[PDB]
Structure formats: structure tokens, C-alpha cells
Symmetry: C4
Subunit: 140 residues, 4 copies
């Protein structure tokens, strides 16, 4: 009865500053990558205020970006991998006035400055090499 | 049917922290400069909480300033030009507690610390060497 | 009909984050010092969340402090004097989540981190070598 | 009639950004340590968004941590002791968007970045080598 992928669901009330999203799943044993998108609308090539994108590669890293008017911006990356193949994780996004704060398994991970206004984000999209267990929205 | 210049319109409800303004237009092919003012009232020499002022010069740059009791303060500038002559742009201002954040074509550009209280800004004024397409206020 | 000194008046609704105070007066020609206190209650030795205290001395400076349970804390100071003897000034305090931001004559001056919760401040007290013209509270 | 220890009480309305907690007690003469927990629920091994934990040791210090899904995260510490054995103290926590700000006896002490969303904290727990006099919640 776990959510199938791709997961795409509205954020109840829309995204607003002060909200958090909290995200339990498992990285697949053979994971290459997955993403979570804070999306502007329901369409499938919707703009994305915040794309959070762990990648196992040469350098295991997380990539962060925004898609606006259909175009990816300047990638930010952190060359650190807080997920592990085959392991359960807890992934939390907190929406602060200046940034999304990302916390993985209780460990602060990254702060991504807003590039598109928070109150454009209406949907959460999740897909890739993971199994999704729960998604809960808080404070909205 | 595009807006004529100078454009001067009230911000619905007044400016408040958490609001954004999003601004589509085109830099003219022969642009020297333009500005967007976050203005205190409707009069034509009203104070300006935030003047955003791209200038092609020797050094292509953006100038940022505040006019208070009729006098320009200390200019801030960034010696980088995110607009291009003859090209369409997307210009976003996000009103955070400490600053206006400016994002141009999806690329974070500048943070201008507040010098006059946000809740004095009642009007948006736009003028100069641009063609204006849309202005949308969000979160207010 | 200008306000007499010491000036002590309630802040309508109490102080809250997002509020500003804006303060027109004149430094006296023979000014040594003055202060503005964000006070906890109406009594005369009330605690003070934020004491803003320009001083002409050897080093012309502004002193910033908090009085809690009747005791002054660690002074902060900036060795710069934005007022001038005999001159009119505009003094603005903006209450942000992390600090009071002080702006004098349109020029950002200082950010004083909160030491006592903002929602303890109920009164504004002003006294010293100045003539007071106007005090206006915004956003509360 | 002072509160007995361990003290565990709900935060009226739940914790929210903008709230403060203010905490008068006395360090015991023979204090080794005490803590204040911002807890997620009433159970006794509840998760803890913020554990504030002064310790007299070799190095007198304060330890700060989060317990999530039953596990302590990466300790932060400050090798400074703002309490003193046998002395009364005033301990204030201010909940800002990015961090808890800790102020002890009027002196700013530490800012602890949020690791679990504020709006998960429902209870305050206090225990250890102290005598507790008052706990007051503000702005909620
Ligand atoms: O930036 C987020 C997107 O990256 C896209 O891939 C990039 C790649 O990371 C970069 O190195 C370069 O090769 O350009 C590619 C296309 O922009 C992914 O295709 C996309 O899914 C996002 O992860
Ligand atoms: O600071 C914003 C205003 O600048 C004014 O021009 C300045 C100029 O930039 C500066 O170098 C100096 O020469 O003083 C001028 C007058 O203050 C513009 O006239 C005004 O429109 C704003 O852009
Ligand atoms: O810190 C704000 C208060 O300062 C007091 O004076 C201080 C003085 O600045 C310091 O150098 C030292 O001498 O201790 C004095 C007493 O704490 C003023 O008396 C008071 O009005 C505030 O300005
Ligand atoms: O981090 C907060 C908790 O610390 C626990 O003790 C730690 C200790 O500080 C550390 O040095 C190491 O030895 O691991 C211990 C167990 O995680 C306390 O037991 C606990 O009460 C908290 O203070
Ligand atoms: Na902030």
C-alpha cells in the first residue's frame, strides 16, 4: 500500500514560509539517483522552484536546481552523500524566509536560497531509485 | 495592449514581508537604463524604499538606492549586467524580513537590505528603456 | 506643541516582529547624549530590551545595551556618530526576527540582536539632549 | 510550591516561530549537569527537537543536540559555562525562523539551527541538578 512512483500530489493549501515536508523512504540497493521537486502546478514539465537530486556517480553528491520557464538554472551541489543504498532515510525540508533547509536523518545538510517565490509551489513530485513510505506536510 | 511607460500602479493591499513581484519585459535594443521603484505613495517625487536601476555605461552594472525625504542615499552597485539589449527578461523581487531578494531569469542576483519600512511602500513605478509585458504581485 | 521630555508612551498593541518606529527630532546644539529605550512596562526603572544611546565624548559613538532584572548587560558600540549637533534627524528602527535594524537619515547604521523577547516591550521612552518632533509606529 | 523535577508540561498551543520561553531557576551548589528539552510529545523517550545541556566536567561547557527517531545527532557544544553553582539564573529561548536563540542572564549565548520542524514540539521537559522557580511561555 506504499505510494507508487512517480508520486505527484498537491501541497494542501499551497507551500508557504513556515511549512515543512517530511519524507520517509528507502534508497534502492542499486540506486543511481532520485529527486524531489517542489513544483509550480500539476503539469509534467511544470516549473520547479526547488529540485533536490542525490546522485551516485564518480563523486557521490546532491545536486540542487530550479527550472524556470522550462530551463534549468545554475546547479548548486554538495559533494557529500547523506543517503545509502538499501537504507531507510528521513528527509526533511523546512521552508524558511530565505531558504529551504534540508535535514537528512537528523543531520543538517543544506540551505537552498529561494529563486522562485514559495507561494508559486503547489505540488510535490518525487521519482527515481527509491521506495517511498510516507510524505507529511506540516504547518500549512 | 502592453502597459505604456511610465507605469505607476498601487500594490494591492500595500507591500508586506512575504510578497513577491514578478515582472516580464524586454530590454530595448538601444537600452541605456531603466528602473523599478518601490514607492511610498502616488506622487511623482515620492520617496522610494528601493530603486533598482540597471545601467549600460562603461561598466555595465545595476545601481540600487533609496530616496528618503527627497534625497538619494548611498548607492549600492553590482558590476554585473543580467539583462541584454533586445532580449526578454523575467525579473523577480521577493520581500524577505531583512532584504529584497532580486532574481533575474531564474538566477539569484542581489539582496538589498531594507532602509525604509516595507509597509510604507504603496506603489510600483517602472520607466526607462524597456518594453513592459506583465507585472504580477504574489502573496499579498 | 512638540512632545516634552522625558517622553514615555505605550506602543499601541505592544511591540511585535515586523513593526517599525520612526522618530523625527533635532540633536541639540550642545548635545552630549540622548537615548531611546524599548521598555518593558511603564515604570521608570523598567527593564529595557533595547537601549540606543548616541554619545559625544572623546570618541563620538553610539552605545547599545539591554537592562534585565535591573542590570545593564554587555555594551555594544559603534564608533561612528550619525547625528550632528543642531541638526534635524530621521531615526528608524525596524523589528526583524533576529535584530532591531537602525537606520539614520536613510543610512543603515546597526543591527542589534534581540536579548529580551520583542513581545515584552510595551513602551517607548526617549530622553536626553534632543528636541523631539514626531514618533510614529508602523505595522502593529 | 516551586515545580518538582523532572518537570514535563505541554507548551500551550504548541511551539511556533516567534515564541519565547523564559526560565528562572538556581543551579545546585553541587551541580554536574541539567537539561531543557523541547520535546515532540509527552512520552518519556520522545524525540527532542532541541536539547540544551550545561555540563560541569573537565571543560565546563554546554552541549546542544537533537534526538530523532530515538537517536542523538551530532552534538554542538560551546566551551563556555554561563551558569554558576549555587546561583540563580534567567534562561531565555527565542524561537526564530532559522534557530533557537539562547540568552543567559541577559547575555546572548548561542544560536541552535533547527533540525526538526518547530511545529512538532509540543512539550517542555526540564531535569537535572537545578532548582526550578518559573517557566513562562510568550507569544504563542
Ligand atoms: O540541474 C538539474 C538537472 O540536471 C540535468 O542534467 C544536467 C547535468 O547535471 C549537467 O551536468 C549537464 O550535463 O546538463 C544536464 C542538462 O541540464 C538532469 O537531466 C535533470 O533531470 C536535473 O537533474
Ligand atoms: O542613486 C540612484 C540615482 O542616481 C542618480 O544619479 C546619480 C549618479 O548615479 C551618481 O554617480 C552621482 O552622479 O549623482 C547622481 C545624482 O544623485 C540618478 O539621477 C537617479 O535617477 C537614480 O538612478
Ligand atoms: O550601557 C548603557 C548604560 O551605560 C551607563 O554607563 C555605563 C558606562 O557606559 C560604562 O562605561 C561604565 O562606566 O558603566 C556605566 C554604568 O553601567 C549609563 O549610566 C546608562 O544610562 C546607559 O547608557
Ligand atoms: O548529545 C546529547 C546527549 O549526550 C549523551 O551522552 C553522550 C556523550 O555526550 C558523548 O560524549 C558520547 O559519550 O555519547 C553519549 C551518548 O550519546 C547523554 O547521555 C544524553 O543525556 C544527552 O546529553
Ligand atoms: Na530571517
Amino acid at each position: 500500500y506504499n505510494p507508487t512512483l512517480p508520486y505527484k500530489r498537491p501541497i494542501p493549501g499551497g507551500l508557504s514560509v513556515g511549512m515543512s515536508v517530511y519524507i520517509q523512504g528507502m534508497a534502492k540497493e542499486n540506486m543511481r539517483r532520485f529527486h524531489v521537486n517542489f513544483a509550480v502546478g500539476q503539469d509534467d514539465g511544470a516549473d520547479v522552484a526547488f529540485h533536490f537530486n542525490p546522485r551516485f556517480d564518480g563523486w557521490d553528491k546532491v545536486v540542487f536546481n530550479t527550472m524556470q520557464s522550462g530551463q534549468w538554472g545554475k546547479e548548486e551541489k554538495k559533494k557529500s552523500m547523506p543517503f545509502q543504498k538499501g537504507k531507510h532515510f528521513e528527509l526533511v525540508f523546512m521552508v524558511m524566509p530565505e531558504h529551504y533547509k534540508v535535514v537528512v536523518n537528523g543531520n543538517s545538510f543544506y540551505e537552498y536560497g529561494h529563486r522562485l517565490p514559495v507561494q508559486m509551489v503547489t505540488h510535490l513530485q518525487v521519482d527515481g531509485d527509491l521506495e517511498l513510505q510516507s510524505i507529511n506536510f506540516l504547518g500549512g
